Design a protein around this ligand. Structure first.
Ligand SMILES: *CCCOP(=O)(O)OP(=O)(O)OC[C@H]1O[C@@H](n2ccc(=O)[nH]c2=O)[C@H](O)[C@@H]1O
Lengths: 7, 693
């Protein structure tokens, strides 16, 4: 639900 | 058969070298000589998977298993292919089958651990990685992935020993020219040298170069002037994150604010349309929008870019999820620049510039980066907050005078306040104060009862906890709220009569040193609390315990992760934000400043550790930047005790979020445009890339 900056 | 073994063994070595085309040819030769060669099928499948030929890979994994039904490694690797196809059920069925066949098979446990982590099951991922390491104690991939899992939940058992071992693992892998087990995006979290971080990045960039070399493409011919484009510089923004993602929340207004007399904007999406207004806006406002998710072959996708005639191709992913840096390895444009989405160097020769600034990336540390520095004049950071959350430009309060106990925001706030009998205006430009009367009591009652909304004098008054029930697009930041929203400390269990320090970052950005600084601040400021997020919830008891051991008595209050608009709005309830020095709030930094909340930071050496200082410098609040840990503590404690000084600093942030360049997307775009023309004119005169200040 909460998009984040990820590898 | 023995002839087939020699071909297979050679293929395996060719693959390790990155000679993918030759590896495939040899595996196919091995199968021609010995058709029932299970290992050859499985190895061929693995290289086909690497090339993105997922159905062909599957076919060969199944052939390997038909030949040898107990081939656990085939099932394990087939699982990875199914995971890449978004078939999590199929992936778990394969991993669990592999582990059933051979419970001592470390690689399978490690693959299972990864899918647990990706699914949001950190405790099971930890357990499966520990099984892998018990079975194979020298397993760099599993150790480093475990280290990140432990980081995510703030498990700091043997932290310093763990950090030393991570550095040791990287040294050893770099010395043997293997792909390092630490991911480039994670490298800023660990005490690695700048050389080691750059080298990690370079080796990951080289994986893309190996993949494109199969295609046998000549260098593309690049424009030498702007003749074919009517004197317009053609800029291509490449991103997997045109949609509901922090990067769109930063830059969705930029494409549309480009000067069409001098620029032609192409947006290359690497992701399909997610249905959100973020994607709608970039599609509507870019001069051209190209969905490269429909073109999975990187050769044809890179041709698609070269036809369009791009001058500057901008890499907004770096080594984040959804990247297709194979597109950049092919060099379809003459100038290729890293911008915004990735807080680090690519380490790659195929990227020419990194768009940064003097505060984030000072000239001293230019060896940290493989690219040349291209400075924006204030900060390279930008946020779309003025467009997304204009209801937070002004606020009112209810006097139960505090600016952050009970807060109202809304586009129609002025009209609502004008309908009320005895509103007091406090000069700061100004803050309206609703005195404790019947209307203020109606609002407080809505909040206390947990009601969704009420009506006062015909105005819609919404409970800030209920935004998704009122307008889900307003909750996500896709639409501006059309009601007046109420936000209170009591909604989050925060104290009415004490200082609230906040940090709204994912918990992985906190380390032992940081929590020790925060504890020291809290001990110096009686009754104050630290407000953190359940990001994720399984990190809470670790934080609370380590804080207990440092001497903190209910001084840390956790709240759930909120929808975007609520997250930004509730930052108005804090007095001060305490930034994470290991890796700063980036988007989260902009969020807190938009609420008018001062942020204390300590810039480090990495790009990721200096963004908050750059934001604050652009904002014009140099007094919030600490040079060492003592200064960080002293600044934070002064803000929590000297209440006139706090009022002054908060007033400064509140005004300067509008008057400074920080949230001014038009000014930013124009400055970015000047930088693009410098880059272009430098190249058009036959020069190679050089630093730009
Ligand atoms: C690509 C880096 C983005 O910046 P960063 O500050 O590192 O933020 P991430 O952790 O990658 O993403 C956080 C993401 O979540 C939003 N948020 C945070 C907290 C909350 O309760 N609700 C949210 O909606 C932030 O706004 C940010 O977009």
């Amino acid at each position: 639900v909460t998009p984040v900056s990820t590898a | 058969p023995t002839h087939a073994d020699s071909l297979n063994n050679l293929a395996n070595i060719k693959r390790e070298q990155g000679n993918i085309e030759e590896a495939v040819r040899l595996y196919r030769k091995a199968l021609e000589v010995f058709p029932e060669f299970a290992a050859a099928h499985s190895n061929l499948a693995s290289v086909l998977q690497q090339q993105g030929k997922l159905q062909e890979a599957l076919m060969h994994y199944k052939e390997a298993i038909r030949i040898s039904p107990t081939f656990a490694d085939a099932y394990s690797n087939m699982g990875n292919t199914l995971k890449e196809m978004q078939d999590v059920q199929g992936a778990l069925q394969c991993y669990t089958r592999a582990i059933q066949i051979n419970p001592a098979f470390a690689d399978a446990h490690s693959n299972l651990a990864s899918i647990h982590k990706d699914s949001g099951n950190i405790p099971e991922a930890i357990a499966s990685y520990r099984t892998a390491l018990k079975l194979k104690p020298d397993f760099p991939d599993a150790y480093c992935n475990l280290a990140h899992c432990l980081q995510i939940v703030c498990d700091w058992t043997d932290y310093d020993e763990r950090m030393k071992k991570l550095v040791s693992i990287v040294a050893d892998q770099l010395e043997k020219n293997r792909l390092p087990s630490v991911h480039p995006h994670h490298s800023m979290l660990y005490p690695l040298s700048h050389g080691f971080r750059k080298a990690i990045a370079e080796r990951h960039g080289n994986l893309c170069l190996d993949k494109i070399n199969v295609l046998h493409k000549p260098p593309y011919e690049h424009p030498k002037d702007l003749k074919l484009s009517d004197g317009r510089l053609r800029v291509g923004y490449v991103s997997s994150d045109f949609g509901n993602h922090p990067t769109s929340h930063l830059m969705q207004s930029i494409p549309g604010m480009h000067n069409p007399d001098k620029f032609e904007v192409f947006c290359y999406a690497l992701s399909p349309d997610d249905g959100t207004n973020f994607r709608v806006k970039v599609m509507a406002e870019a001069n051209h929008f190209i969905d490269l998710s429909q073109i999975p072959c990187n050769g044809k996708a890179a041709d698609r870019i070269h036809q369009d005639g791009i001058h500057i191709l901008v890499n907004m992913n770096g080594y984040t999820k959804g990247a297709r840096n194979e597109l950049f390895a092919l060099r379809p444009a003459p100038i290729q620049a890293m911008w915004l989405g990735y807080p680090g160097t690519s380490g790659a020769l195929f990227m020419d510039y990194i768009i940064t600034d003097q505060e984030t990336s000072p000239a001293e540390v230019a060896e940290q980066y493989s690219e040349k520095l291209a400075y924006m004049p204030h900060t390279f950071f930008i946020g779309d907050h003025a467009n997304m959350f204009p209801h937070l430009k002004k606020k009112a309060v209810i006097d139960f005078i505090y600016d952050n106990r009970i807060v109202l925001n809304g586009i129609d706030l002025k009209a609502f306040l004008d309908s009320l009998p005895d509103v007091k205006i406090v000069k700061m430009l100004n803050m309206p104060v609703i005195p404790m009367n019947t209307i203020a009591e109606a609002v407080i009652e809505m909040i206390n009862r947990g009601q969704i909304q009420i009506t006062i004098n015909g105005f819609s008054i919404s409970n800030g906890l209920a935004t998704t029930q009122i307008n889900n697009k307003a909750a996500t930041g896709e639409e501006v709220p059309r009601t007046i929203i109420v936000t209170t400390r009591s909604q989050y269990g925060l104290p009415e009569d004490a200082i609230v320090y906040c940090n709204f970052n994912q918990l992985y950005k906190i380390d032992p040193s940081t929590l020790q600084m925060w504890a020291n601040i809290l001990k110096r400021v009686p009754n104050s609390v630290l407000w953190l997020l359940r990001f994720p919830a399984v990190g809470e008891p670790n934080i609370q315990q380590y804080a207990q051991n440092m001497g903190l008595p209910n001084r840390i209050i956790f709240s759930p992760v909120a929808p975007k608009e609520e997250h930004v709005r509730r930052g108005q309830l804090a007095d001060v934000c305490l930034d994470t020095p290991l890796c700063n709030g980036h988007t989260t930094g902009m969020d807190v400043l938009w609420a008018g909340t001062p942020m204390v930071t300590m810039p480090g050496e990495t790009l990721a550790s200096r963004v908050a200082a750059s934001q604050l410098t652009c904002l014009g609040c140099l007094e919030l930047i600490a040079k060492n840990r003592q200064e960080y503590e002293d600044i934070a404690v002064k803000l929590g005790t000297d209440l006139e000084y706090l009022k002054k600093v908060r007033g400064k942030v509140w005004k300067q979020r509008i008057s400074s360049p920080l949230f001014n997307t038009k000014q930013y775009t124009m400055e970015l445009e000047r930088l693009y023309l410098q880059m272009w004119e430098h190249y058009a005169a036959g020069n190679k890339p050089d630093h730009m200040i």
